[PDB]
Design a protein around this ligand. Structure first.
Ligand SMILES: OC[C@H]1O[C@@H](O[C@H]2[C@H](O)[C@@H](O)[C@H](O[C@H]3[C@H](O)[C@@H](O)[C@H](O[C@H]4[C@H](O)[C@@H](O)[C@H](O)O[C@@H]4CO)O[C@@H]3CO)O[C@@H]2CO)[C@H](O)[C@@H](O)[C@@H]1O
Ligand SMILES: OC[C@H]1O[C@@H](O[C@H]2[C@H](O)[C@@H](O)[C@H](O[C@H]3[C@H](O)[C@@H](O)[C@H](O[C@H]4[C@H](O)[C@@H](O)[C@H](O)O[C@@H]4CO)O[C@@H]3CO)O[C@@H]2CO)[C@H](O)[C@@H](O)[C@@H]1O
Lengths: 884, 974
C-alpha cells in the first residue's frame, strides 16, 4: 500500500532530469548542478555550465534572496539559471528567458566566482590552503594529523603523543595508548572527532562578543586554514580590522617535560588607527579517565573527579587541572595554561569557569550567556570543562600573542608517580617557553626535523605537486603510521591497539629512520614486535593467537633491516573472511628471506624447494591460485570451479591477494602470471581500480552494500600490494608485451591512490589531498576514510620500486620502470655512509633493461652489471641510465 | 613550586567570604548568593537577602549592563547589592552606600522579581510548571518520563516503549530492550540524553527563520513547560503574536500498530489581525542499530545504512525511514511522518533533507543555513538525520495543527518479519489518526488510564502537594519501574537488562494492577520472574529475552517468595500454587509453583549453607559494592560439585562467608511459604515449615548476634581465626578512629522485617543507628570501613562512601514502622516513628521545591541518593526508593494485608490530628478516617474506639468484604 524508495535507485538524478528538460533548449556545458524542488522528484532547479562537479545549488540555497526568488516558479514547474554575458537569466520550461533581479544577480555572480577552487588548493610545498566558508567533499578532506617526538626517550612507540585537527582547529588530542588529553566524542557523525569547545576561543570588546573561532559570521571577511607537515595555521580578518592567527602543533620532548603537551599560539594584530581593549576566553573539555563509563555510567564519570586550580610561586592563577579520586585515574594528570604576551609584559589569565552549564547559560556554545564575566567557581563534579579568561589592550599596529599549553604527565615515564610530578614538569615547560621567540623556534625545530627526515628519497620531477606529495606528505604519513598504526585519526577513535601486522609500516619508514641516525630506534621497534605469536599490543597483549597471518610478517622486517645495514648482530589478513593459500606465500617468502639472512650471518635453501612445490601442485587450481583451500568437508575457494560465486556471468571467486603474493614470494611461473593477469583484467580491474575480490555467495560456506569495504570495493592497501607484484613481474618476466601491460596497470592504479590528484574533481573523489585514505567506493569513486591505511606504506614502497631501487646482498638492484609518457626521471637517494644522484633518460614509449638496450654509468665508468654497490666513501655518486 | 587548589580543599566559599566582609556592616538575611571577582579568590561580589538559595549572581552577569557596572569596583575591591527602600544600592567595603544607576536598578528589580519560583512550581494536580529561561537545580530536575502501554499484548514486560523528555522536549525514545527509535547521546554531560535535533522544529516566514523550539530568543515572550503524568506540554508566545503548543506522549497499543510510536502535536494559533504564510521544518536523528560500533567504528555505523523515502497510494511523500544492509539490523524498521492540518484539509510535507551537513551548512543547529529550502536528497550513508518541511497559511484567529509520528516496527512482535510489515502497520496508524479529534481523544485515554490506575489508594489530607505527589506522581513512578526496572532514564542509558531483584517494584504496583482488573498481568509477571529459578532453588541474576548468570549473586532467588506471598494473601489465589512453569535448567521441563517455592527455601536452608546454619554469600548479595570472597562457586558449578561430594537434603562442602542479610531473607521466605501452605489447605507443609523457622531463627540469633548489632557477612573461611565477622562491635574492620566497627543499616532493617530481632535487640540497634548511621541528611548505608586490595572510587558523600542511599534507607523505615507497631516500649515506638517520618521528609519528591538549588533531585520523581556533604539529591530517577516509599506511606497509614484481612494499625505524625484516605479492594471499597489529639498515638499503647459501618469492633483486623459497597472505617484515639 505504501511505497519505499531507498537512496540506491535505478531512478533518474536531478542533473539527468535537468538534461531531459533543458538539454536541447539551453547550453548546459560539461558539468551542471541541480536539485529537486519537491519530494515527488518531478521537477528540478539547476545552474548550467560549471567548471567542475560541485554542490553549487546547495550553496545558492543558503542565500535567502535566491530561495525566495524561486518561490514564484518552483515547486510547480522546472527552472535553470544561465550565464549569457555577465548578467544571469532564469529559463522556464515554457520558453521564456527572464533576466533575474539585481539582488539575485548579485548572489549568482558571487556564488559562481571560484568554483574551480572551492575544495582549496595545494602550495608548492604540498600544504593545503582551505577556505572555512566552502563546503567539504567529505569528512576527512580538511583534516590534518599531528604527532609528537619521543626519539631517544623511554618507550618511544607507546609514549609519543598524537592529535587530529580539522580546518576550524576542532578535534582531540592523546598521550600514550588511548589516554585522552582533550575529550574525544563518540557520536553519530564522522565529522565530530572531539568535544566542540576543544581549542576554540572568543574575543570580547567592552561587553559584547565580537568573535568565535568556530563561527564564520558577517564580521569575518577572510578566513583561511593551511594544513602542513605537523602543524596547522588558521588565519582570520575581521571587518573591525583584526588579523587573528592560530597556530597548532605538538611540542617535541625535552628533558623534564610532561609526556604530552599541545601548543596553540594566537596572534592578534590591530590593523586599525585606534587602540582596542579586548579580552580572550579560551575553552576546552578534558578527556575522562573512565572512558568505558561514558556508555555504562555517565554519572560515575562525573562524580569521580573535580576541578582544581593551579598557582605559581607568586600566588598568581595560571590554569586548571581535573583531579580524580580513584587511584587508577590518578596515574595521569592533565592541565591547561595560558600566557598573554603584550610586547615585554607576560601575564596570566585573570578569570576562569569550569561548568559548561554556567558558561553557556541561556545561550549556546557559539554565543554563551556567561562568556564575558566568568564566575571563578571550581566544580566539585566533572566533566572537565574549562574556560580561561584574560583582558588585554592592543595598540594600533602592535600584536598581542596568547600561548596555551594543554597537556598531560604520567606514571608511564616517571617512577613513583603523583600529581607533584606533573607540577614539577609543568614548571619546566613554562620556564622553557618564558621568552616569546621560544615558540617560533620550537616550530622551526619541528619543520626542519621533517624536511630533513624526508631527504632519504627525493624526486626532482617536473610536477611540483607530485614531488612535495611524495617528498614531504607521504613521508610524514608513513612516519605517523609507524607510531600510531591504525589507532588514532578522525573517525578511528575506539580501542584499536598497535597491531602486529602493522609492522608493515616499518618496511617503508625503516630506511628513513636509519638515514637520520636512528638505526637504534629501528632496532628497538623490531624487538618490541619480536617480543610477542600475539595479534595485538600496547603495554600488554590483546586477542592472543587470533589471526593466522600475524607472525609471518616479522621476517620481512628483519630481512629488510638486515640487508640494508648488514647487521646480523640483532638475533588471516582479511578481517572479513570468516569460514590459507595467502599464508603459504608469506611463509614461503619468510623461509626464503631467512635463507638469505642466515648466509650473511643450505638448511633453508632445500626447504624452500619443498615448501614451494607443495603450493604450486595442490594450490594452483587451473586458472588462478586458490585463496582458502578447504580440506574439511566444496574443494576450495578462489579459482575456476570453486562453486561459490554470486554472479551469473563469472565462474568463481577471484582474490587479488592470491595473485599478488604468488608473485611477491617468487612462486608463480611466467606462464601462471600471464594467465592470472588476463583473469585480473576481466573481473578484478574496474574504472576505479583493482578490486579486492569478485562477487561471492559466502552464505553457502554480509555487512556492506556493494561498493563499500569488503563487498567489492577498491581496497587500496590490497591494490598497492597487487601493484608491488605487477612491478616485480614487469622487471623479471621474459615477455616484454606482458611487462608493458603490467606496468600499464601499476601506473593506472597509482594515479587513483596518489593523494594530490584528489583535488582534480574533488566533490566526486573526496578522500584527502595530502593523506592516503582506505578505499574507493566502486559505485561513486569516492575515497573513503580512515586516513590511516597501509595504502601509504605500499604506495611509498611502490613508487621507489618503480624508480628502480631494490636492496639486495651486493647492493642496489637498479631496474627502473618509467611511465611511457616520461622521458626524464631524476631523484636523490641517501645511504648510511654515502649518497646517490640518479638520473634516467629514455625516448617516449615503454622501456626496461630486460628488453631495451641501455648504457649505465656510475661516476663516469660504465658497468654492464645492473647491481650498484653500497658505497661507504661519504660522497655523492652520480648514476646515469640512457635507454636507446 | 606550583600549588594545586581543589574544589573540596578550597577553604572559604564566596558566601562565607561575603559574610566575613559584610556580615557586621549590612544585613544579609538568611540567604545570599555571591561570586569571586578574581582567580586568587580574595574578593567577592554578592547580593544580600534572597528568599532562598539561588544562583542570582550567575543570572545577573548575563545582563551586560550589570557586568560593566561592576567594572569600576571589581576586581580590585569587594561589593554587595542591597534593596533599601525600592531603589537598589551597591555597598563598598570602604563605607559608602552608592545608589546604582537607573538601567542597573531596572535589571536588579527584574532579576530579583520571583526568585522564590525560579525552579518552577507544582499545580494542585502535581504537574511541574517550568520556565524555559530559568536555570536548572540539576540534570534530572526538569526531566519527565513517558511510557507506552502493552497490557493484553504479547510480552508486555519486554516490548513496552519508553522515552525521556526534558523541558525543551529534548531526549531519546526507545522500543524493546535497548533498541533506539531516536538517537541516544553517549557524551560527557548528564544533561545530554539525546541528539540535540530530536523532537525540535523551526518556523519560517517569507524567507527568514522566526522560531526554534530549543532556542529562547528576543522574539519569545512567554515560554513555559508543564511536565505531567505521561505527557509533556510546552507552550510559547512570540512577539509577532503566535501561540505555539507542543504536546508529547507515547501512543498506547492498538491492533496492528507499530511496536513503538511517539506522537508530538504542534498547535500554532495566529493571534494577530492579519493572516500569515509560514512553513515548518521538523528535525530529528534516528538511533543506530549498531550501537556498539559508535565507539569501536563510527564509519561502520554510517556505511551499513542509507536513507529511504515513503510514499502513499496517491504518490505523495509522507516521510523518511533508515534502510539497513545487514540482516541483524533489518529486524527493526524505523519511521517518521508528518501531517499538516488546516481546518478541513489534511496534508503531508512537501520537502525533506537527510544530511546534517547539508541542512546546517555554514550555520549552526540553532540557525541552519539550508533550513528554508530543503534539497530532497536521500543520503546513501548514515547517520539517520532527517528534516521534514511543509508550508501552510494560518488565517487570523484560526489554528494550524501539525502531528508527527516517529516510531518503530519489529520482528519481536511479528512472525516472518520484513520492511513490508512496518509499511502495513504505519498505514494502520495513519488511518487511525486521520481525523484531527483522534489525537486529543487518545491523549484523554492516556490521562484517564492513570487517574483511574491511582484510585487504589488516595490520600485526602490537607496538603494538596503531598496528595497529588502520592496519588498521581508516585503511583506512576512505581508503574514506570515495574516495566523499565533501572534500564532507561536521563542518565541511565547503557545496557542494563531487567534485574531479578527489581521484582521488588512489583510488591507495590501489584495492588494497583489487580484493582484495575489486571490480576492476569500480575500473574504473567510473577511467572516470567519465576521461570528463571532452577530445579535446585538458586536462580538467574538478570534477563530480557533470555536469562543469564545462574546462582551468581546470592540474594536474587530469595526475593521471589515475597512477591508470591503478597499476591497470594491479597487475592487468596492458591490456584497459582499448582501451575507448571518453564525452568531455566534444561529441556522443556515444567515444575509446579508449589515445588518451585519449596526448592527455593530448601536451597538456602539445607543446601547452600555454612558453618553456623545461615545461607552462603557466593560472589555477592544485595550490595553491588561488597566484593570480598576468594573463589566463588556458580549455581551450576555447585550442581556439578554437589554431585561430586554425594558420590536433596545434605549441605554443600565449603567454608564460605555467610551473608547474614540473606539469612533474614530466607527466614522470611520460609515463614512466608509457611503461611502460603496453610491457606493452600495443607496441615503437613505448614507443619513442615512451622518447625523449620524455629530452627532457622535460632541459628541466626545465637551465632549472628555479635553483642551490639547483627553481623552482615559472617566470615568462616580463615583457618587461624583472625576475622570472625563483618558488621558489629569487634569485627576489626573500621576506618574511623572514633567508631568501633562497621555497622550496616540493612542488618538492622532485615532483622526486624523477618521478625528475628527481639525488642531488647531492636532498642540496642536503634541507639547504634542514631550514633553513627543517622545524619542530618538521613540514614546512611554503612559506617566508614577499611575492607582491605581494592580502595575507593567515590569521594566521601557520593554513592557507597557514606551516602544516604534512599532505597536502603526506605527499607530501614519499613523496619522502623513495623517495630513501632509491635514493640512493648511506647517511648521506643515513638522514637522509631520520629526517625521514619524524618527520613520520609528527605525522600518525598515534592519537598525538593523547598530550597531546590541546594536539594536538586526532581520534584515529581524519586532519585537515588543524597550526598552527605551538600544534601544534593543525585540521580538516577529510577530507584527502589519510590517502591518502598510507597509501601512505607501506606503502612504508616495503617494498612497491612494478613490472612484474615487488613491489619489496621496507623502511626500518624505527632503534628497531625486528622488523616483520611480511600482504599479499594477487588470486590469492595473502604473509607478510612482517623482522628487523634496532638502527640504520639498507637493502638498498642493509647486507648481508642474503632468503628466499621457504625458498629464498634474490638478486633483490630478488618475483613476483606465482597459486597461491592464503600465501607466507612473510623478510628478515634482518646
Ligand atoms: O582486512 C583488511 C584490513 O581491514 C582493516 O580492517 C577492518 C575491515 O576492513 C572492516 O570490514 C571491519 O569492520 C568491523 C567493524 O569495525 C565492527 O564494528 C563490526 O561489528 C558488528 C558485528 O560484525 C556484528 O556481528 C554485531 O552485531 O554488530 C557489530 C557492531 O555493533 O564488524 C565489522 C566486521 O565484521 O573492521 C576492520 C578493523 O577492525 C584493518 O585495519 C587492516 O589491518 C586489515 O588488513
Ligand atoms: O548497592 C546499592 C545499589 O547499587 C545500585 O548500584 C550501582 C552502585 O551504586 C554504583 O556504586 C556502581 O558503580 C559502578 C559503575 O557504574 C561502573 O561504571 C564502574 O566501573 C569501573 C570499574 O570499577 C573499573 O574496575 C574499571 O577499570 O573501570 C570501570 C569504568 O570504566 O564501577 C562502579 C563500581 O565500582 O554501579 C552500580 C550499578 O551497577 C544498584 O542499581 C542497586 O541494585 C543496588 O541495590
Amino acid at each position: 500500500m505504501i511505497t519505499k524508495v531507498t537512496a540506491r535507485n535505478n531512478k533518474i538524478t536531478p542533473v539527468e532530469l535537468l538534461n531531459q528538460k533543458f538539454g536541447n533548449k539551453i547550453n548546459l556545458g560539461n558539468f551542471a548542478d541541480a536539485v529537486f524542488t519537491d519530494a515527488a522528484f518531478k521537477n528540478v532547479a539547476g545552474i548550467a555550465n560549471l567548471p567542475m562537479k560541485a554542490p553549487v545549488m546547495q550553496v545558492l540555497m543558503e542565500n535567502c534572496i535566491v530561495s525566495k526568488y524561486l518561490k514564484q516558479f518552483v515547486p510547480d514547474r522546472s527552472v535553470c539559471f544561465v550565464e549569457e554575458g555577465q548578467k544571469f537569466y532564469i529559463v522556464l520550461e515554457d520558453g521564456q528567458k527572464i533576466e533575474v533581479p539585481e539582488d539575485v544577480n548579485k548572489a549568482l555572480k558571487a556564488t559562481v566566482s571560484d568554483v574551480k577552487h572551492w575544495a582549496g588548493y595545494l602550495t608548492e610545498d604540498g600544504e593545503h590552503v582551505i577556505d572555512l566558508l566552502k563546503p567539504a567533499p567529505g569528512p576527512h578532506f580538511y583534516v590534518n594529523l599531528l604527532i609528537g617526538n619521543r626519539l631517544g626517550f623511554k618507550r618511544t612507540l607507546q609514549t609519543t603523543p598524537k592529535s587530529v585537527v580539522d580546518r576550524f582547529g576542532r578535534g582531540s588530542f592523546r598521550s600514550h595508548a588511548a589516554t585522552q588529553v582533550l575529550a574525544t566524542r563518540f557520536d553519530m557523525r564522522q565529522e565530530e572527532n572531539g568535544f566542540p569547545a576543544n581549542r576554540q576561543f572568543y574575543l570580547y570588546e567592552d561587553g559584547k562578543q565580537i568573535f568565535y573561532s568556530a563561527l564564520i559570521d558577517d564580521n569575518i571577511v577572510e578566513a583561511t586554514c593551511k594544513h602542513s607537515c605537523n602543524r596547522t595555521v588558521i588565519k582570520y580578518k575581521t571587518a573591525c580590522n583584526l588579523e587573528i592567527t592560530r597556530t597548532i602543533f605538538l611540542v617535541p620532548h625535552k628533558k623534564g617535560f610532561p609526556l604530552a603537551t599541545e601548543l596553540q599560539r594566537i596572534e592578534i594584530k590591530n590593523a586599525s588607527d585606534k587602540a582596542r581593549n579586548l579580552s580572550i576566553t579560551y575553552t576546552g573539555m578534558f578527556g575522562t579517565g573512565a572512558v568505558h563509563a561514558i556508555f555504562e555510567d555517565v554519572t560515575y564519570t562525573n562524580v569521580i573527579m573535580q576541578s582544581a586550580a593551579l598557582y605559581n610561586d607568586k600566588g598568581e592563577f595560571i590554569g586548571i587541572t581535573p583531579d580524580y579520586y580513584p587511584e587508577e585515574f590518578k596515574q595521569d594528570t592533565r592541565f591547561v595554561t595560558m600566557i598573554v604576551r603584550n610586547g615585554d609584559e607576560k601575564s596570566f589569565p585573570q578569570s576562569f569557569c569550569t561548568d559548561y552549564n554556567d558558561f553557556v547559560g541561556t545561550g549556546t556554545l557559539e554565543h554563551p550567556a556567561g562568556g564575558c564575566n566568568l564566575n571563578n567557581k571550581l566544580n566539585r563534579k566533572g566533566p572537565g570543562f574549562f574556560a580561561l579568561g584574560a583582558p588585554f589592550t592592543v595598540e594600533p599596529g602592535k600584536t598581542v600573542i596568547i600561548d596555551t599549553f594543554t597537556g598531560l604527565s604520567s606514571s608511564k615515564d616517571n617512577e613513583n608517580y603523583s600529581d607533584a610530578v606533573m607540577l614539577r614538569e609543568l614548571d619546566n615547560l613554562l620556564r622553557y617557553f618564558e621568552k616569546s621567540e621560544s615558540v617560533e623556534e620550537t616550530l622551526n625545530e619541528i619543520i626542519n626535523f621533517h624536511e630533513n627526515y624526508g631527504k632519504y628519497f627525493q624526486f626532482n620531477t617536473g610536477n611540483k605537486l607530485f614531488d612535495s606529495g611524495f617528498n614531504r606528505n607521504l613521508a610524514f604519513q608513513v612516519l605517523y603510521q609507524t607510531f600510531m598504526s591504525r589507532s588514532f585519526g578522525q573517525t578511528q577513535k575506539g580501542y584499536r591497539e598497535i597491531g602486529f601486522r602493522e609492522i608493515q609500516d616499518l618496511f617503508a619508514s625503516m630506511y628513513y629512520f636509519i638515514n637520520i641516525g636512528y638505526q637504534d630506534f629501528v632496532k628497538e621497534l623490531l624487538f618490541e614486535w619480536t617480543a610477542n605469536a600475539n595479534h595485538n599490543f600496547y603495554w600488554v597483549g590483546k586477542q592472543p593467537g587470533l589471526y593466522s597471518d600475524d607472525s609471518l610478517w616479522l621476517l620481512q622486517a628483519y630481512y629488510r633491516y638486515i640487508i640494508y645495514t648488514k647487521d646480523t648482530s640483532v638475533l588471516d589478513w582479511n578481517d572479513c573472511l570468516k569460514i590459507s593459500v595467502m599464508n603459504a606465500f608469506l611463509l614461503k617468502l619468510a623461509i626464503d628471506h631467512l635463507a638469505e639472512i642466515a648466509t650473511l650471518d643450505q638448511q633453508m635453501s632445500e626447504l624452500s624447494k619443498e615448501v614451494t612445490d607443495r603450493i604450486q601442485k595442490h594450490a594452483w587450481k587451473e586458472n588462478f591460485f586458490a585463496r582458502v583451500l578447504i580440506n574439511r568437508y566444496y574443494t576450495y575457494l578462489g579459482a575456476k570451479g570453486d562453486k561459490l560465486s554470486a554472479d551469473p556471468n563469472i565462474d568463481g571467486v577471484y582474490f587479488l591477494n592470491s595473485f599478488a603474493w604468488s608473485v611477491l614470494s617468487d612462486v608463480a611461473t611466467d606462464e601462471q602470471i600471464a594467465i592470472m593477469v588476463d583473469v585480473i583484467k576481466k573481473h578484478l580491474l574496474t574504472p576505479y581500480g583493482l578490486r579486492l575480490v569478485t562477487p561471492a555467495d559466502l552464505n553457502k560456506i554480509g555487512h556492506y552494500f556493494f561498493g563499500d569495504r569488503e563487498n567489492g570495493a577498491v581496497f587500496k592497501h590490497a591494490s598497492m600490494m597487487a601493484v608491488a607484484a605487477l612491478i616485480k613481474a614487469a622487471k623479471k618476466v621474459k615477455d616484454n608485451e606482458l611487462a608493458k601491460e603490467m606496468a600499464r596497470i601499476a601506473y593506472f592504479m597509482i594515479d587513483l591512490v596518489l593523494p594530490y590528484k584528489n583535488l582534480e574533481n574533488p566533490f566526486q573523489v573526496a578522500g584527502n589531498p595530502r593523506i592516503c585514505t582506505q578505499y574507493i567506493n566502486t559505485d561513486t569513486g569516492e575515497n573513503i576514510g580512515p586516513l590511516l591505511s597501509g595504502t601509504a606504506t605500499w604506495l611509498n614502497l611502490n613508487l621507489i620500486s618503480l624508480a628502480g631501487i631494490e636492496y639486495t646482498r651486493d647492493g642496489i638492484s637498479f631496474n627502473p620502470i618509467l611511465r611511457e609518457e616520461e622521458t626524464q626521471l631524476n631523484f636523490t637517494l641517501k645511504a648510511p655512509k654515502c649518497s646517490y644522484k640518479f638520473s634516467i633518460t629514455k625516448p617516449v614509449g615503454f622501456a626496461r633493461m630486460e628488453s631495451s638496450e641501455y648504457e649505465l654509468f656510475v661516476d663516469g665508468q660504465k658497468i654492464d652489471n645492473t647491481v650498484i654497490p653500497m658505497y661507504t666513501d661519504e660522497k655523492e655518486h652520480i648514476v646515469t641510465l640512457k635507454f636507446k
